[PDB]
């Protein structure tokens, strides 16, 4: 009845895709399966995954899928009777959560070497344990939060001032400059954003992203793969300790 919230009808140019997009996903996976010899299942547990585009550009000659997990599972087939190819159903069993497919015409050892040598620094992300203590210096705060030398740094922005306050540093606006305490220092002590060995909240993660300080590492973890010629799936170390479907 009445006493209900009214959601805004957005003046936008893109709308929700839904079933016909799920259908393109089905068609693309089913047309991709026969074209390649090996299918890898990889996992990206707690990473921002904005480096997947560079991974794609590097493996331009490989077809990588990262969609909704249940849709990918059912496109691959969940039962031995609805499989497109033999055993893609038990590869669906490795396909459990924040995972992706990788169809290749290449050698499993070369794929594993690439994704074992590939590693890039990324922002903390919520839930990760802090590997360090990051505290801002007392005084005028800069755009890096006292990580690069201050003499080679630019002050943080007055439009990030109110956002920085809502994230929780007692910082003030003196003469157009954001400073913690007083401009000449003294005043107050520093603000320790994160402590060693402590689960980081989204507040702290947003603080770290605003200060452009990276604490986490992006690494794709290959859970397993499947060769079509033998019709056989091989487990690479990861799935013995990662929960399965």
């Amino acid at each position: 009845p009445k006493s209900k919230r009214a959601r805004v009808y957005h003046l936008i140019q893109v709308n929700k895709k839904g079933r016909e997009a799920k259908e393109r996903l089905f068609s693309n996976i089913r047309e991709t399966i026969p074209k390649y010899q090996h299918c890898f299942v990889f996992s990206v547990d707690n990473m921002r995954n904005n480096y997947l585009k560079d991974v794609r550009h590097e493996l331009n000659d490989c077809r990588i899928f990262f969609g909704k997990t249940k849709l990918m599972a059912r496109a691959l087939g969940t039962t031995p009777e609805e499989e497109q190819a033999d055993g893609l159903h038990r590869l669906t069993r490795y396909l459990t959560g924040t995972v992706g497919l990788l169809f290749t015409n290449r050698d499993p050892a070369d794929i594993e070497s690439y994704f074992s040598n590939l590693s890039q620094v990324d922002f903390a992300r919520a839930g990760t344990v802090a590997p360090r203590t990051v505290t801002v210096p007392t005084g005028i705060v800069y755009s890096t939060g006292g990580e690069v030398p201050p003499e080679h740094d630019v002050p943080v922005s007055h439009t990030l001032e109110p956002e920085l306050r809502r994230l929780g540093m007692p910082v003030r606006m003196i003469k157009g400059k954001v400073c913690l305490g007083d401009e000449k220092g003294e005043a107050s002590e520093g603000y320790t954003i994160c402590k060693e060995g402590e689960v980081l909240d989204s507040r702290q993660t947003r603080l770290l992203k605003l200060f452009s300080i990276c604490l986490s590492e992006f690494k794709v973890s290959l859970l397993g793969y499947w060769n079509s010629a033998s019709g056989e799936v091989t487990e690479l170390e990861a799935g013995k300790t990662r929960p399965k479907r």
């Binding site: 009808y9 003046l11 936008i12 140019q13 709308n15």
Partner: peptide, 30 residues
Amino acid sequence: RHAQKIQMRKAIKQHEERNVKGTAKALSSQ
């Protein structure tokens, strides 16, 4: 509020149409 809701409904309908899609003054002036 009647005028405002009529305006909002017209704006919503016009936006839906345009998102789906991919003289008397002259005589009087003379």
